[PDB]
Amino acid sequence: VDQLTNDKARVEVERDNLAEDIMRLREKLQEEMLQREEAENTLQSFRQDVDNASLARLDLERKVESLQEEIAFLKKLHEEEIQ
Amino acid sequence: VDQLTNDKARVEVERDNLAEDIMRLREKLQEEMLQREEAENTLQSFRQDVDNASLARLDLERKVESLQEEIAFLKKLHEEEIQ
Amino acid sequence: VDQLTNDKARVEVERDNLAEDIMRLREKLQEEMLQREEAENTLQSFRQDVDNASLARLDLERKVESLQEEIAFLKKLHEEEIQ
Known about the structure:
The structure is a homotrimer.
Chain A: H1 7-75
Subcellular location (chains A, B, C): Cytoplasm; Cytoplasm, Cytoskeleton; Nucleus matrix; Cell membrane
Region (Coil 1B) (chains A, B, C): 1-83
Family (chains A, B, C): Belongs to the intermediate filament family.
């Protein structure tokens, strides 16, 4: 009457193999997570870099204009007054 | 003769647990997808930022050269002509 | 006495479906991997871009100072000597 010895062995084999595939995908998944987590950090550092670059490039543009004004005045001074 | 009541219960337990692990990996996977999708967007914005920075840094380099030329002429004017 | 024909069919159905879910998650996982791998490359190119931008923005700041010095000397020359 009783009969479950060969069936539970089949379930065990199919379970083992399915577990192995789930295992590999999990390990790959964890690997991608750490990678994209460090990528997020590198992303932050990049964002902080471009803004500071935008600040210093602004200070340069303003000082360049200052040089342009002072030169234009040097040009409207010694060349066209009395002579 | 008939016998499948205890076997289908074993399959059900192993199925439930395998489904749970597949479930968690799926949720983590979806989480990584949204994260890397927003990272792709931040990547685009960064690319657009560095090119525009490269355009304005070019306009500055050209105008700096212009200042250098006009100064060099101011220096070759009032100091070394007649006096 | 013998009895495993209907049980192995149940295991087969549950196996097929679990395999299908594992299959999809695997394909999504592979897709995220290639995406984050190319993102890593774009990350490298960005890093190389910001440093070179930092080098040229430095050369500009130094030359701007040079222009400031030469102008300040042009201003302390023709306006306040003998006249």
